[PDB]
Amino acid sequence: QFHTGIEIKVWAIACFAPQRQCTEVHLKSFTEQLRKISRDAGMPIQGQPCFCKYAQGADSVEPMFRHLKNTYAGLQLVVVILPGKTPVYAEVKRVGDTVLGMATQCVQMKNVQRTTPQTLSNLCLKINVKLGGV
Numbered sequence: 001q002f003h004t005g006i007e008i009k010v011w012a013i014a015c016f017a018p019q020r021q022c023t024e025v026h027l028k029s030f031t032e033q034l035r036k037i038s039r040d041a042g043m044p045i046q047g048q049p050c051f052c053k054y055a056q057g058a059d060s061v062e063p064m065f066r067h068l069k070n071t072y073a074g075l076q077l078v079v080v081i082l083p084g085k086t087p088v089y090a091e092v093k094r095v096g097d098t099v100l101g102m103a104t105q106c107v108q109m110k111n112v113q114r115t116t117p118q119t120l121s122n123l124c125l126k127i128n129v130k131l132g133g134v
């Protein structure tokens with residue numbers, strides 16, 4: 001079930017959670033915790049995303065994903081932080097899967113604000129399934 005040989009060197013964060021709820025330090029904390037667990041599991045995600053920006057609303061998804069595709073050669077993944085149930089999820093999947101062919105992984109804001117080994121493990125397993133056997 002689990003894939004070896006994944007190395008995620010070029011990846012982006014698109015934060016659809018409001019900055020006042022999911023701060024720069026929450027993003028840095030979450031990213032560092034994800035770096036360490038993904039590494040321990042032999043699917044290392046490098047500590048520094050090439051891009052980390054806030055956006056709001058489903059209409060921002062296509063412009064930002066077009067920008068990412070146009071700017072970052074060898075981009076392997078966009079981690080999308082969502083604030084609860086939101087039409088932004090459907091739009092991220094429409095643009096990523098059907099328009100631009102860009103791998104995306106969505107995560108709940110509450111799991112970025114406060115991490116646990118179990119929820120970082122849940123996320124690594126979803127990423128592994130996506131980026132494994134390409």
Ligand SMILES: O=C(O)CCc1cccc(-c2ncnc3c2ncn3[C@@H]2O[C@H](COP(=O)(O)O)[C@@H](O)[C@H]2O)c1
Pocket residue numbers: 082084085086087089090104105106107108126
């Ligand atoms: O339009 C509306 O009013 C709400 C629409 C709606 C209906 C059903 C589900 C959603 C939805 N909203 C936000 N996050 C969602 C979601 N469905 C799944 N997710 C998130 O995406 C993650 C899965 O990400 P990937 O599909 O990239 O593996 C789930 O863990 C969960 O964290 C949104």
